[PDB]
Design a binder for this molecule. Sequence first.
Ligand SMILES: [Cl-]
Ligand SMILES: [Cl-]
Ligand SMILES: [K+]
Ligand SMILES: [Mg+2]
Ligand SMILES: [Mg+2]
Ligand SMILES: [Mg+2]
Ligand SMILES: [Mg+2]
Ligand SMILES: [Mg+2]
Ligand SMILES: [Mg+2]
Ligand SMILES: [Mg+2]
Ligand SMILES: [Mg+2]
Ligand SMILES: [Mg+2]
Ligand SMILES: [Mg+2]
Ligand SMILES: [Mg+2]
Ligand SMILES: [Mg+2]
Ligand SMILES: [Mg+2]
Ligand SMILES: [Mg+2]
Ligand SMILES: [Mg+2]
Ligand SMILES: [Mg+2]
Ligand SMILES: [Mg+2]
Ligand SMILES: [Mg+2]
Ligand SMILES: [Mg+2]
Ligand SMILES: [Mg+2]
Ligand SMILES: [Mg+2]
Ligand SMILES: [Mg+2]
Ligand SMILES: [Mg+2]
Ligand SMILES: [Mg+2]
Ligand SMILES: [Mg+2]
Ligand SMILES: [Mg+2]
Ligand SMILES: [Mg+2]
Ligand SMILES: [Mg+2]
Ligand SMILES: [Mg+2]
Ligand SMILES: [Mg+2]
Ligand SMILES: [Mg+2]
Ligand code: NA
Ligand code: NA
Ligand code: NA
Ligand code: NA
Ligand code: NA
Ligand code: NA
Ligand code: NA
Ligand code: NA
Ligand code: NA
Ligand code: NA
Ligand code: NA
Ligand code: NA
Ligand code: NA
Ligand code: NA
Ligand code: NA
Ligand code: NA
Ligand code: NA
Ligand code: NA
Ligand code: NA
Ligand code: NA
Lengths: 132, 53, 337
Amino acid sequence: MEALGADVTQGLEKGSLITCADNTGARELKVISVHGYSGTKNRHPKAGLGDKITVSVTKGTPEMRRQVLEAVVVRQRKPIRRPDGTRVKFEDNAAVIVDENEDPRGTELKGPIAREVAQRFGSVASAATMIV
Amino acid sequence: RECDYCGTDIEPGTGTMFVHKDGATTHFCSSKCENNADLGREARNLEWTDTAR
Amino acid sequence: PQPSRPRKGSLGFGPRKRSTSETPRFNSWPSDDGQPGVQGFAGYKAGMTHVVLVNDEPNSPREGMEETVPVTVIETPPMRAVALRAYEDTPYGQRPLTEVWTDEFHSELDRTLDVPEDHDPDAAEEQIRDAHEAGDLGDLRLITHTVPDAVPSVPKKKPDVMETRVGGGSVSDRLDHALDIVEDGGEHAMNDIFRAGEYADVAGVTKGKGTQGPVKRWGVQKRKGKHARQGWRRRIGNLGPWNPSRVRSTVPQQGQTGYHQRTELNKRLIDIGEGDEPTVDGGFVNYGEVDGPYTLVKGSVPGPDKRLVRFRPAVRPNDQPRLDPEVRYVSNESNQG
RNA sequence: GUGGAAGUCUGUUAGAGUUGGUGUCCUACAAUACCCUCUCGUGAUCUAUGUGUAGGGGUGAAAGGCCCAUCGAGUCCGGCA
RNA sequence: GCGAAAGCCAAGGCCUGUCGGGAGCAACCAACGUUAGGGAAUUCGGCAAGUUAGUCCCGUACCUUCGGAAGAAGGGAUGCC
RNA sequence: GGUCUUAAGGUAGCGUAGUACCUUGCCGCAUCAGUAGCGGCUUGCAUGAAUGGAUUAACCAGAGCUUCACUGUCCCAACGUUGGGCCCGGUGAACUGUACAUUCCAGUGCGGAGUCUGGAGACACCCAGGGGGAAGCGAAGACCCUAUGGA
RNA sequence: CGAGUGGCUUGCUACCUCGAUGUCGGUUCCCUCCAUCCUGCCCGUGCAGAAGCGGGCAAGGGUGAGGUUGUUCGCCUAUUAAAGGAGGUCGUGAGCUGGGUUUAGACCGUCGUGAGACAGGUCGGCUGCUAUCUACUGGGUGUGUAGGUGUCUGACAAGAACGACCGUAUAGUACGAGAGGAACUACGGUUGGUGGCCACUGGUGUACCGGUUGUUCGAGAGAGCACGUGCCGGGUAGCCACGCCACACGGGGUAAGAGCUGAACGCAUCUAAGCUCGAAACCCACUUGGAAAAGAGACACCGCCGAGGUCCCGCGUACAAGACGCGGUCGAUAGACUCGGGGUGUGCGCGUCGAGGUAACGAGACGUUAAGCCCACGAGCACUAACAGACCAA
Ligand SMILES: [Cl-]
Ligand SMILES: [Cl-]
Ligand SMILES: [K+]
Ligand SMILES: [Mg+2]
Ligand SMILES: [Mg+2]
Ligand SMILES: [Mg+2]
Ligand SMILES: [Mg+2]
Ligand SMILES: [Mg+2]
Ligand SMILES: [Mg+2]
Ligand SMILES: [Mg+2]
Ligand SMILES: [Mg+2]
Ligand SMILES: [Mg+2]
Ligand SMILES: [Mg+2]
Ligand SMILES: [Mg+2]
Ligand SMILES: [Mg+2]
Ligand SMILES: [Mg+2]
Ligand SMILES: [Mg+2]
Ligand SMILES: [Mg+2]
Ligand SMILES: [Mg+2]
Ligand SMILES: [Mg+2]
Ligand SMILES: [Mg+2]
Ligand SMILES: [Mg+2]
Ligand SMILES: [Mg+2]
Ligand SMILES: [Mg+2]
Ligand SMILES: [Mg+2]
Ligand SMILES: [Mg+2]
Ligand SMILES: [Mg+2]
Ligand SMILES: [Mg+2]
Ligand SMILES: [Mg+2]
Ligand SMILES: [Mg+2]
Ligand SMILES: [Mg+2]
Ligand SMILES: [Mg+2]
Ligand SMILES: [Mg+2]
Ligand SMILES: [Mg+2]
Ligand code: NA
Ligand code: NA
Ligand code: NA
Ligand code: NA
Ligand code: NA
Ligand code: NA
Ligand code: NA
Ligand code: NA
Ligand code: NA
Ligand code: NA
Ligand code: NA
Ligand code: NA
Ligand code: NA
Ligand code: NA
Ligand code: NA
Ligand code: NA
Ligand code: NA
Ligand code: NA
Ligand code: NA
Ligand code: NA
């Protein structure tokens, strides 16, 4: 994929529970896999900012629950390094549900989003309220 | 840049920016300040802080 | 099933034993392209700081923008090519033929060498030119040494001596170029060989760690879960299968770790100056204050502060040189705190 | 409200017991130990001393458990070379 | 302090749970502290460790032999002057 | 089958059971995914009434499973603390030992060799280490068979 | 239907061990095989393209994470370039685990008159040893080559030191009715592996500083203990990874394969002689070790009555002993002192305020005070200590 323009320390793993920063009706998401990723023996597949991960809905509307969908990680508590050397970290871990084309399944995104996520998922960015 | 906490100048190529839930932003020059903040203390009440000074 | 997995650690830097010389010895030299010139230089490690640079990369979507880069400050005062050694090609590879020395010696070179009191430079030079006439002359190198006394932060006065090859146009031309440098007094500087922005290979003896276990030395796992409480924590499962009934040298075992020679490739030279512009407030920890000829190397360099490190024009660069990068800021913030 | 029952509860009170750690030990401190954890702790309770039951016999809330480091028949000597 | 509890301290006893000296004292081992982000993915199994915790007020489900379940759960308070 | 063996021929119940071979039975719950667990079905290889059946509040260092919380169990390891370890003075055993012995790769051999054969490698001594081999040490195999053995 | 190869399964045999070669499964750690799952290079296609199917060379590298089950196997999920199979005493218990098989306790079903049994199920049920030899990882002492210092050489040895993927331009292009949809090349990034490093972020930090509970030293001040910090908050150096830096291309020779010239055989023929190309594979390149390479090396200088070295003293860029490296008055090597640079967070005392209280008393607030306390770093500085001196040596 395109360079994020920032170094990331994956702060998530297969099985992690994260916030669904949109109005799709899914509140909590459980990470299942990381797109294009292959680890190594004993290593828990890891995911962080800007990765497209497969997920399952743990909390939310009955119809949304248990569904296996795709999403993009928009925020993480673990720091990331920007070109100027500064580190950036968020208050929580969050992802936004996406479709085949990478267009947000929802209509509105809740909470801020990392600028680096723009250089990868345009339609997700062009739906952001706040882009830090 | 200036540390949104203590007030001293943040040495370039240094520090962390914490993004609040609401979207607000806070640049810290060090762990000492971040930690003092997480304790719920306000820089104005800490005598070593440039702010307070 | 037993999932596959790469072995622990590389088998290419062994045996993992203590280095014979604290002063590195390059086992390769650049190719004879440009004009004649010494193919290396040396300095003493001091510490690290960062610098803000202007994105120099023509292919970077950020070219032209600010950018923080880690740098290792290395004091690179002038050295002295005290002699020109000549090699001859033979059925058994190259062998030293003769050497051309000078008379002007640094006050304390006798702390290491039995300085020459009687030498015949011309005879040596003759023997070399004859060799060249016959076409048996192998490459040409210069016996070089440092002047630790010019570096206060470094305790030693005893100079470090090493041989550096001379690559140049024709053999005749560079042979002459060699003699010229030597005859003077051999005094040369980082400037004469490198230009900020070029890529160099830095060799050096890593920081010693004495004896260490397989976990640290080779990267093997620690015993996991219940196994970690049985009496074994940092020991590998076994030294091998029943057969072959012997322990193979390839199994990760305890031993000397650190204090090995390493030649780290393609290190970009961010800047070459002189003064105290790169020094840190309070002084470089466990080193001292810098105020003289220095070189800023991008990233890290093998070895601890004060150790001698060697420079050589990259022998296998990936990128083209992008000379004199713009440095907008050099941090002098204390390294304590 | 009084009263203060209980093979009642909590409890390293004393005291009794011995679940997990399959830790330490495993030519031991120890021929059954050490530490942490854990169970009971007014009752069919725990305990000292005295006293009774003896080997195809005792004793046994029964595991073939126990009867002096000895038990699907103790120990000693003899039958016996 | 509820306390024959902990912790600290008297009286009284001891430095005899009886080999010492040296190295910032490496690997490795025994006990153990702290570990960012993730949070059982480890494993036969959450084994080990951790969490909770004292007291007062509020409040407390299914089920039930009406005794109980129950300290259910959950919420709040707690110092000094 | 619409009596026959041998007296009767399984009733209330429970049921894939700590009893179900086929078996990961089928359906459902739950999970991304559940040979597990729970519920229903159930023709039960080979359930069933004091050989007690069903069921059950309370109790339990009893067996299995799920959730919240928690966390170095794990991702993936780091640093530190104390006692050892290492060097020095003093004290001072044991296990084990046919002999020889610096081995390695192959082969051979009673078919699982440091010692045979062919090659390869190999200057001696010493320190620390984790235990690959000596079918390592420890125990006249508990398994199995045999004995005109024992209990 | 016919001929075989392997020695992973199962069966057969009874050669080896019953004065014992510790079980299954798992784990950890090392090497290997190819009948190739991915990756490279190719051939055919029912090959338009894209996506495939089948085949050849090829073992360099990769082949991962999870839910049920002790399981091996296998079923299932989401990722993936792909999530290949097999050998090493079914590799690996003087390494671990101990869930299963298969001790002694018990239950159920079936069988038996019964003791008790089961190629049925189930709960519980132990893991010994101080390494003599050998082997290897690392470290020393000697001898050989035959005085010393410094610098090299390179017989050989090791490496995967690099493997792989995604994205952009190419290009909505070639191809195609359309749907759909490449490539060469050049770029950016990711992942796995590898080596090093600590400016940055992060961890530790029983150095240090502060807060505070209980108790003891009468109070205050200042302290001990509470497990080897009472607890809580912050945290320098160092060490570290979760942090950062670096890790080609290109030549040479080949395989499969594509061809050239070309004869046997006037033609034809990639082959018989000759030649041009062509794989992640091979060699070189690059990194590491390497004068004990018995052909036991080379060069320069110093020295054979003196070159150099060991011991000694102050120390670490080094370190388990040993080794290594630096400094030694012609000196900044270590300590003191003073600065600098850092960590805490505002000291004792005194003054004012303070809910109140006759008063006594009074938690606490402000000032003095970026104070007080502290530092494993740097500089200045010969004040202290690197003194004295011993020895070996052609
Ligand atoms: Cl995955
Ligand atoms: Cl393990
Ligand atoms: K046997
Ligand atoms: Mg695993
Ligand atoms: Mg800082
Ligand atoms: Mg154990
Ligand atoms: Mg620092
Ligand atoms: Mg009771
Ligand atoms: Mg009790
Ligand atoms: Mg009695
Ligand atoms: Mg019995
Ligand atoms: Mg953590
Ligand atoms: Mg699991
Ligand atoms: Mg697992
Ligand atoms: Mg437990
Ligand atoms: Mg069922
Ligand atoms: Mg009846
Ligand atoms: Mg032989
Ligand atoms: Mg026998
Ligand atoms: Mg038997
Ligand atoms: Mg009998
Ligand atoms: Mg054995
Ligand atoms: Mg093949
Ligand atoms: Mg291979
Ligand atoms: Mg085996
Ligand atoms: Mg195996
Ligand atoms: Mg073994
Ligand atoms: Mg064993
Ligand atoms: Mg042992
Ligand atoms: Mg078992
Ligand atoms: Mg079991
Ligand atoms: Mg069992
Ligand atoms: Mg000899
Ligand atoms: Mg204490
Ligand atoms: Na043990
Ligand atoms: Na242990
Ligand atoms: Na074995
Ligand atoms: Na009453
Ligand atoms: Na116990
Ligand atoms: Na008897
Ligand atoms: Na007798
Ligand atoms: Na019956
Ligand atoms: Na009981
Ligand atoms: Na820990
Ligand atoms: Na062994
Ligand atoms: Na035997
Ligand atoms: Na096994
Ligand atoms: Na391969
Ligand atoms: Na499985
Ligand atoms: Na075996
Ligand atoms: Na064992
Ligand atoms: Na085993
Ligand atoms: Na090639
Ligand atoms: Na030699």
